Design a protein around this ligand. Sequence first.
Ligand SMILES: [Cl-]
Ligand SMILES: [Cl-]
Lengths: 4, 4, 241, 241
Amino acid sequence: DEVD
Amino acid sequence: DEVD
Amino acid sequence: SGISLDNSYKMDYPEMGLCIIINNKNFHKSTGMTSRSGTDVDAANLRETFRNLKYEVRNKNDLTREEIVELMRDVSKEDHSKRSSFVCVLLSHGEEGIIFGTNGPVDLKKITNFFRGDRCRSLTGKPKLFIIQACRGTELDCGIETHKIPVEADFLYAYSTAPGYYSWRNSKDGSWFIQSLCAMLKQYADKLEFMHILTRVNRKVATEFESFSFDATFHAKKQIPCIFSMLTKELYFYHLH
Amino acid sequence: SGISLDNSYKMDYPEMGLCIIINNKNFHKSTGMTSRSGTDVDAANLRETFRNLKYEVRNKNDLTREEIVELMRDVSKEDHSKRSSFVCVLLSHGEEGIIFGTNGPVDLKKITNFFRGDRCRSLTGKPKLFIIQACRGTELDCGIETHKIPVEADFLYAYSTAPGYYSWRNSKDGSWFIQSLCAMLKQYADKLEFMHILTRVNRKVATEFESFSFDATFHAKKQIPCIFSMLTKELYFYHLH
Ligand SMILES: [Cl-]
Ligand SMILES: [Cl-]
């Protein structure tokens, strides 16, 4: 999970 | 007619 | 029992819920904000409309920013366990993200934060509807001829106008948006899901209203409302036996 | 003929319309923006999903801010007379009101203005859908345990996340929102009106996803998408005949  |  | 579906909010709690109407007509002289002629027509129409949907309506008039915050806080601390939903209607001056108390502005985020899923537990999982008749800026639309849930989930913001735009209020008839909203709820609340009702409101405002002004800057202007849905289920104001 | 209703957009033009997918994965080193692992999964899923809805899909990869603006302008100057609708999907970094080209930001207002009712006449009165997988700020949702029309009318912004919040992308599976959107379109596009599809997307993202991180600041976080509708009619991807 990564943020944009 | 009037604006808020 | 037989197969079950859960695509729609449970709206058969003992109570539909509160409908808080904040009707700001007269502003402190020092703010320089004009009186909002026509807003009492809106507040009366809303009271009757939500009464017929079986909401417990509370009308409040000419609240300061401090009174708005205290009212919202207190309401968020009530026990809503027996209530299906929550409705707040804001009638005032505004800008983007802001509505005005009689003496100055209130951040909309401050108001709505009281009802977050983690801060008002008796409304967690229930629809929280904020209906906002207020300007969102100064643009004019000149038209064209033709485990856990998120704390921001289950909110709906029914904005009278697009982000950045003025919103139009008629001094005799009430605001274009509130007029149209009440008319569509009266006609369709026993028939249509709420997003479809609000879409009919969008069409009514977009097609049936155009400003008339002796000032060319403000003449012949149009409006489109804005539905801002973070709901997770369909919302019907009726329920089945 | 018999009585007629017109509460739904006409979607039986010869063509459904364009679906422009802008897939920005790799950014210029000088911007400092990380590579968006997982976005190719999203772009492929979207291409297949909208192909099956009979859209003319155009995939574009790693566009500069200048290329994004030129592409949108050129597309808005095409003759859309035979097309029912227009779809644009933006996959990139972002912040509130902004999408990133590979070398810097693009104002979302600049992109969407090309398609205003008065500026793209062959799309006037037709639905213009902007689907945006991008951050809108840096907030994290901690969750809780359980005869004229307006120029801004007929736009729909299907935002992956609430205003002000980060949006979550899985490097293996794709973004939570795009994953969920394609799944719900595949299952329901022949059955449900578009707002009801997007409401199922809201519920899927809100209930089935939670972040996992070795960093406590970013761990166990939740997301709710945001439907921003200025549509004036119901939107079904199918038609009767
Ligand atoms: Cl009045
Ligand atoms: Cl990838």
